[PDB]
């Protein structure tokens, strides 16, 4: 396999996949968010 053809694979196959691979761990992420919204508000109240 040639070098340049591989580069296309790097750009359009590897890079996307490397990105997809980094897990969100969303349950722990959602916690981060909820903590985040309480902290911006905090000492102020509610809406919006």
């Amino acid at each position: 396999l040639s070098g340049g053809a591989s580069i296309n694979r790097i750009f359009h196959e590897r890079f996307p996949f490397e990105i997809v691979k980094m897990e969100f761990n969303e349950k722990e992420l959602r916690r981060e968010i909820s903590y985040a919204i309480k902290n911006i508000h905090g000492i102020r109240t509610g809406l919006f």
Binding site: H41, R44, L47, F48
Partner: protein
């Protein structure tokens, strides 16, 4: 929607209660000073005391 914009407008409105509120104190001071002057007509016979 800006949480702080709500607060901003309200704080403007609340400040506007200083006028009618101070005025109220004066209207009370007026009635109070009138009353002490009303009562002291019963003590008018003594000029220096009244």
């Amino acid at each position: 929607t800006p949480d702080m914009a709500f607060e901003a407008i309200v704080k403007k409105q609340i400040v506007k209660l200083k006028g009618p509120s101070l005025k109220s104190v004066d209207l009370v001071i007026q009635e109070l000073i009138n009353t002490v002057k009303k009562c002291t007509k019963k003590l008018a016979n003594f000029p220096r005391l009244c």
